[PDB]
Amino acid sequence: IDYAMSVIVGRALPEVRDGLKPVHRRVLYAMFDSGFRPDRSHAKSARSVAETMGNYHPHGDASIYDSLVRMAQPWSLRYPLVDGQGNFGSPGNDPPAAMRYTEARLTPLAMEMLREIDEETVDFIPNYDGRVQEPTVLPSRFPNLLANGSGGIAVGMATNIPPHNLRELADAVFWALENHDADEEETLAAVMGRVKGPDFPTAGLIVGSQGTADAYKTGRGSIRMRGVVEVEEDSRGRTSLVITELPYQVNHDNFITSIAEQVRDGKLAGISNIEDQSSDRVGLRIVIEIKRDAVAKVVINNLYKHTQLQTSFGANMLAIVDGVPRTLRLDQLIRYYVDHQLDVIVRRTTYRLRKANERAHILRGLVKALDALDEVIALIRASETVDIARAGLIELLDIDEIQAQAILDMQLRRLAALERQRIIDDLAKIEAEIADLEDILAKPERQRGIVRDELAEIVDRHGDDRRTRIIAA
Amino acid sequence: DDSLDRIEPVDIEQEMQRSYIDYAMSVIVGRALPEVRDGLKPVHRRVLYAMFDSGFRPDRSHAKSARSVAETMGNYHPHGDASIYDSLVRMAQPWSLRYPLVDGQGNFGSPGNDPPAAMRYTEARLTPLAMEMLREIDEETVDFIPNYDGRVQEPTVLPSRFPNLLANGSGGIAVGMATNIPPHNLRELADAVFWALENHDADEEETLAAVMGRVKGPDFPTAGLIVGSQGTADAYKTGRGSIRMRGVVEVEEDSRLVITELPYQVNHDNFITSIAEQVRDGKLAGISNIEDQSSDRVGLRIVIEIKRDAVAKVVINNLYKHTQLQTSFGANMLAIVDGVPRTLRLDQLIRYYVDHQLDVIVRRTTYRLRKANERAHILRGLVKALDALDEVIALIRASETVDIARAGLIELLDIDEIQAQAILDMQLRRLAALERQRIIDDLAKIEAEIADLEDILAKPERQRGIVRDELAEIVDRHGDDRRTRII
Ligand code: NA
Ligand code: NA
DSSP: OHHHHHHHHHHHSOBTTTOOOHHHHHHHHHHHHTTOOTTSOOEEHHHHHHHHHHHTOOSOOTHHHHHHHHTTOTTTOSSOSEEEESOOOOSSSOOOOOGGGOEEEEOHHHHHHSTTTTSSOSOEEEOTTSSSEEESSOOOSSOHHHHHOEEEOOSSOOEEEOOBOHHHHHHHHHHHHHOSSOOHHHHHHHHHHHOOSBOOTTOOEEEOSHHHHHHHHHSEEEEEEEOEEEEEEOTTSSEEEEEEEOOTTOOHHHHHHHHHHHHHTTTTTTEEEEEEOOBTTTBSOEEEEEOTTOOHHHHHHHHHHHSTTEEEEEEEOEEEETTEEEEOOHHHHHHHHHHHHHHHHHHHHHHHHHHHHHHHHHHHHHHHHHHTHHHHHHHHHHOSSHHHHHHHHHHHHTOOHHHHHHHHHOBGGGGSHHHHHHHHHHHHHHHHHHHHHHHHHHOHHHHHHHHHHHHHHHHHHHOOOOOSEEEOO | OOOOOOOOTHHHHHHHHHHHHHHHHHHHHHHHSOBTTTOOOHHHHHHHHHHHHHTOOTTSOOEEHHHHHHHHHHHTOTTOSHHHHHHHHHTTOTTTOSSOSEEEESOOOOSSSOOOOOTTTOEEEEOHHHHHHSTTTTTTOSOEEEOTTSSSEEESSOOOSSOHHHHHOEEEESSSOEEEEOOBOHHHHHHHHHHHHHOTTOOHHHHHHHHHHHOOSBOOTTOOEEEOSHHHHHHHHHSEEEEEEEOEEOOOOOOOOEEEEOOTTOOHHHHHHHHHHHHTTTTTOSEEEEEEOOBTTTBOOEEEEEOSSOOSTHHHHHHHHHSTTEEEEEEEOEEEETTEEEEOOHHHHHHHHHHHHHHHHHHHHHHHHHHHHHHHHHHHHHHHHHHTHHHHHHHHHHOSSHHHHHHHHHHHHTOOHHHHHHHHHOBGGGGSHHHHHHHHHHHHHHHHHHHHHHHHHHOHHHHHHHHHHHHHHHHHHHOOOOOSEEO
């Protein structure tokens, strides 16, 4: 039926607001709700998988651990959300260890995605069995969809958003925050000016400008990615080619294999031997030894030709906007994100203000009780029951049942001189807070300034240098 | 293993390997078979405890099985959900367990080949009997140990307020050795236990006879009939025996052969299949047609019709012969006692259970006694404060800080820091007339409790009487009529 697709496209494509699919959102939220934060010891992955399975994804589905694992791989995510410990696989064919052998916890950036989620910043909905509530989206204090990108298949409509530099994106966002009046085309230009292009975790080089611009303005484009090969004098002492970087998503093992197989086919003469000298110290380092009668330049170009040393990234900016799949331009992605940020901020202050009032209400009744301490005390001791006392206090002080209950819940230790003053002082602080909150609600410029300052803090702390180099040649 | 005369470097490695195996498998066996005390294997114990720790109690709504499977998987059994759900499911089937521990809702399968629904479609919760297995587990009644990752503690055994191992029985294979204990009647077992409680001085031969006298034999949840006495007796006195089970066929006619019960563990579908596949092979001539007419509200009903020629029950006898309408239960009372597998006699099973019950009770009393004292300590200081209420109140209001107040109170009342902190933690509502009296009354109750507790610790007869009364209560509520009929 019509809702069939609406569900297939839910597991297939990412939301534009946080850039996540239901699985990942569930996993992250589960870890959060479990307290698996960065300032705490890693927890066995089985714990996270289990918390997700029982509350949100009731399947012995391998897709849970698969999501947890992937969000931990620095070669897959430009900005990882999971902090892994143990065997989480490799850029090659080496498979990850079982749930029970690995440990995981959230990264500081992931903590920014969940920031203030308990302050009604996003809409929650009941889970599969209706016992608990789950988030439809995360606050996403940092532009995750564009930062980490996304890749998924729908009914022939598969998304393919590339990763980007956090510092750059933040610049584009800051511009959109100040130029709220601007029109799309005026914005499309400013954002395209700040975001130089994709920034893959694997580094490498992007060759050209067409693919990028096409993607940013038409939501579709072919980006030319190229590995990084160095030329070295070997112990031969002749020439050896050294590939230190590969294009995004290129499997190291499959790559080396294609070279050896392509060679045997006779398609890659000039090559004497291939050897992997990679390591955590040296990083990627595939040494290709060329024959003494060979030109480095010709071998290189033949590599670009017959291997993934040079490959294309087929960008397709397709995301879910209000439950409907859509192909977007960079300016739309940016505006939809900013809108969400603003929505989060108003909702946050709306919530804080409500709770601030409830707090002040109680305090006003505690202060009243203080000004009549001797009376309330005698009244309470004279009362045969707490009910009588509750009723007597309401009458005696002119307060409601909640306020009257707060007084009866008060502890002896709060009667100490400095304790009593603390109640007074608090009341003043709370009233001042309420005012400031009401001010934010009244001024859209204040709200805009808040998202800007908070985002700036985030970029200062977690922002990093660009990895992928753009080559106009 | 092997033998000695070699003097080689390859034989040093051979000896060590044999040693590691012995140690290795001597430990694996501790898992394959059930413990004497609670009758459970680690999987089941973990599942039950997880449900308990989650609050999935009989007095609350069923929860999706996936929740139970998940709680188990993450805290105690991180290997997968297959083994877990299978255990949860098995413990909910009234045709498998004489006394189910899990209360299932939805498709938990059938006595035949119909498979259960997925964990997201079924719901489950603990039965009242399961709640008895976990009774007082939070009062240091059993030894706990850290779990796989050391983040949480898990039980090595459950309090087991009812004789589960003998009640529900058990069947497993560890290392060539496989246990096979049959289920029994709770009311009967309780009688045997009550006897052992009163006749603590009795000897093996006497106890054996006394218990064999109260437990008439296995009582399968699938009812049926046991033919003979040798098998049963053999099992109860040698820990091994062959018990003959028989279905219940009550033939009828037109209007123009009805099997209503099958032996324990006999698959309904496989049974009917064996009949048809054999008949068509001519091996079972004299049968016109088979027909399943069972349904909830009627029960098992397999209709078998004979040819005109033979209206003889000789067809019944041919059934007993070539089908599972009559099959044997190979009893083998093998359980884990102190980490070591052992074949036991009914009296040993009974005494080891009683010992555990007694252990649980003194441990419970010991714990309750400690907590009471800590409680009485606090109360004594709250009462003191009450007798000087006006003073303590003025003192507190005069104190510039809670520290000053804490110090002032210690002096003023002659009490320690803990007692002095309890007073400062006291709430206004506790100053109400009836509230104040409640503190006084409590102190008297606590002191009385402590005394009684200390008494239990001193008297073994009191401890024995406690397990007897509590067990009696359980049998009155959850005990049920016998199902299997003997001879
Ligand atoms: Na008021
Ligand atoms: Na005292």
